[PDB]
Design a protein around this ligand. Sequence first.
Ligand SMILES: CC(C)CCC[C@@H](C)[C@H]1CC[C@H]2[C@@H]3CC=C4C[C@@H](O)CC[C@]4(C)[C@H]3CC[C@]12C
Ligand SMILES: COc1ccc(C[C@@H]2NCCc3c2[nH]c2ccc(C)cc32)c(Cl)c1OC
Length: 368
Amino acid sequence: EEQGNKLHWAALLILMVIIPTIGGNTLVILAVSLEKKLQYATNYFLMSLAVADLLVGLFVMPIALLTIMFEAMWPLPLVLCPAWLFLDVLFSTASIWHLCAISVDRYIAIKKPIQANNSRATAFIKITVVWLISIGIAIPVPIKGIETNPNNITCVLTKERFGDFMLFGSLAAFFTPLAIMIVTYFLTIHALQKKAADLEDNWETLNDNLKVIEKADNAAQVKDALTKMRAAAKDFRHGFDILVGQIDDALKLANEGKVKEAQAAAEQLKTTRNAYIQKYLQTISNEQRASKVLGIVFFLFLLMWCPFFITNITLVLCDSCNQTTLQMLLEIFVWIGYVSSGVNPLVYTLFNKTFRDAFGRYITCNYR
Ligand SMILES: CC(C)CCC[C@@H](C)[C@H]1CC[C@H]2[C@@H]3CC=C4C[C@@H](O)CC[C@]4(C)[C@H]3CC[C@]12C
Ligand SMILES: COc1ccc(C[C@@H]2NCCc3c2[nH]c2ccc(C)cc32)c(Cl)c1OC
């Protein structure tokens, strides 16, 4: 028998995988490096991730073509094989863990909206941890090495040698950040409901004690119903402070005994709650719109790596499956995840108007 020639596949991948991977990540790095409106702390995640996926298209992907164009005889120097295999597992694991770090980070931005500055250092710490985790996962490859009389080596991980690494490594590289991003998913669904619920609670506590005052025919109705709003009240240090002093300024009229004067102070306070509720109504509308975008984009990413890591584990556990027909799948399924990681940064940043504006400027060679 005979297999034939598979050059048209390598041409197809360059046009639709390697070129989009190299081009998309380079656009993302330029947007953070050039445009200063994007030089925030959370975008250093996007830059760190864009550099990892860029290194895939430059070093990992071109060598991976040689398995498709050429034969099963490693055509490059020997040490290059475990180095390429090390870089392959390293950068492919970094991309999945960056998204887990982003999923966790963005959940913290919702649940604990307060922390800010300190944020520049916290990212570099989280970036480092993500890269160190990817090193410890990819380090078994250059340590064990590829087995050899014939100096010709076959550069691929085998089931006999890396059977435990193909399994436990898959557990730590994909299914562990998968399980985390699933947990942070429901944490974010719950965090946004309570954030919107707490709002409905305060909105009525104000609007109920307000109608009490406009219908008040005495001062005691104003005294007690205003204290209910006193304990129920950077920019946040001043947000409540505006109305905490107004309730005090209005109770000052209530301690005087002025009924019509105090009621007029409350009816003119309603133009102050609509200034803070409308602002925080949006903060929660936008906090919910960005979560649904990150949810779908991160899901399609993780979904396009499911074929490889399920087959990568099945090739270890299933003793009755056809090894020839299963490694033929890994040869293909890897390129699906290569696409997933290659364009994941670009897709996620296409939903940012500032990023999308920067891209449209750079594709026509502007650079401001
Ligand atoms: C045949 C293979 C190996 C080579 C593929 C060519 C690649 C490297 C070329 C083809 C198109 C190129 C991109 C075309 C557009 C831009 C916009 C520019 O503002 C930044 C560089 C960037 C993003 C280029 C980066 C390099 C690029 C992706
Ligand atoms: C030529 O095409 C191919 C190119 C590269 C590879 C290796 C693969 N690269 C994606 C990441 C990853 C791989 N292996 C792991 C084993 C364990 C862990 C944790 C991760 C990984 C294969 Cl398997 C190819 O198919 C034959």
